[PDB]
């Protein structure tokens, strides 16, 4: 249905974040017995592993300078983890999971650790599943993050937008080839990039209120 | 160490070690004069610093997840560390010498930073000098350190062991090479390192109590490792 090599890519990205992210409900979620943030905020620093060893795993990113990996990393991170976040929400249960499987509502969020936010990060991750956006759409979606050429202080961004550009070209026949009917498929697509770039402003704001991983070269 | 692969694997390790923890009495070690444990705490920062170093250039652990890296560093930075210095204790005059060239006499120590571990510091080391352990062997026995299975929350533990395997095999025959007359030592080294366990769990007990309860608590690499 696809270029050979575009399969090549999407099973290569698909992998990586499978590898990165492993799926849920098989090693079960659980629903919490009983204000909570605590768990929360200790998953964080395994995400952020995880995330990393994503782009480990792509090389197109490990072609990059040591430099241009971290720099592209530290301004990608949030925004990948929350893409994963909206990965997981389920929609028959109206929930969001953790890589623990820790399971929990909306509102259960609203009270704990994630504010007037929670409705906003939930619109969102319902927005993709009326898109009907696939492990494979999220996986490359997230390298279209992690690979972007107007983050500040690269080294070389022209290469960064180079090494972008089959990606792009690659989910674009990826999801013409799920979506042959709809023609704005793609454009609503990468325009939930720009409601992530927002949305994940909002979320760091409230992070406030890596080093040894830092330590990579 | 019998196969290629083994005499590669202790070059690579031992060029690890070497690249992280310089020979000594060449900027040669130096007593100074009278207090001391400022000057024991600030050489922390590094030595901590060196052991995460020898991580990042060491085959094999960088092959696992960035987490099980960070576990691992974690849990075994304590003991690699008292492996280096023991490493460093010079058996004529008794002394323990740091980074810098920086060397101590056992009593300095008490009063310095180690107090009541000192005596079991100083006989752990005594004990390798014994068993006449060699740079490599040194090497070896951190990474095996580092790459412990057992380890409290890994993700792979599983192949945190697997990939150990190798290491002990080598540091066997190497073991085998150096001391053809007794067969024991590659067993008698192994169990240096449930002393080091011991050692290790005492050494973090110290730790807390004086970081904390300290005029600086700086500075930021330091800080996650410990904690």
Redesign the interface.
């Known amino acids: 249905e696809l270029t050979e090599d575009e399969e090549e890519m999407v099973e290569k990205i698909l992998k990586a974040h499978e590898e990165t992210f492993p799926y849920l409900t098989d090693d079960d979620k659980y629903r919490l017995t009983q204000i909570l943030w605590e768990r929360v905020s200790e998953l964080s620093?395994?995400a952020i592993?995880?995330v990393?060893?994503f782009g480990?795993q792509v090389p197109v990113f490990t072609q990059l300078s040591t430099n241009d990996q971290i720099t592209l990393l530290k301004a990608a991170c949030l925004e990948i983890i929350i893409l994963r976040l909206a990965s997981r929400y389920d929609d028959k249960e109206d929930t969001m999971s953790f890589s623990n499987g820790l399971t929990l509502t909306q509102q259960q969020l609203e009270v704990g650790g994630f504010g007037t936010l929670t409705p906003t990060i939930f619109k969102f991750a319902r927005s993709l599943v009326e898109l009907s956006v696939d492990t494979a759409e999220y996986a490359m979606l997230s390298l279209i993050c992690l690979i972007s050429g107007d983050r500040s202080g690269l080294e070389h961004p022209e290469k960064v937008e180079q090494k972008q550009e089959p990606i792009l070209e690659t989910l674009k026949h990826y999801v013409r080839k799920r979506r042959p009917d709809s023609p704005h498929s793609f454009a609503k697509l990468l325009l939930k990039l720009t409601d992530l770039r927002s949305l994940s402003v909002k979320g760091a704001e409230r992070v406030l209120q890596p080093?040894?991983?830092l330590?990579?070269?």
């Open positions: 620093t395994k592993a995880n990393v060893d480990k080093p040894l991983i330590e990579m070269l």
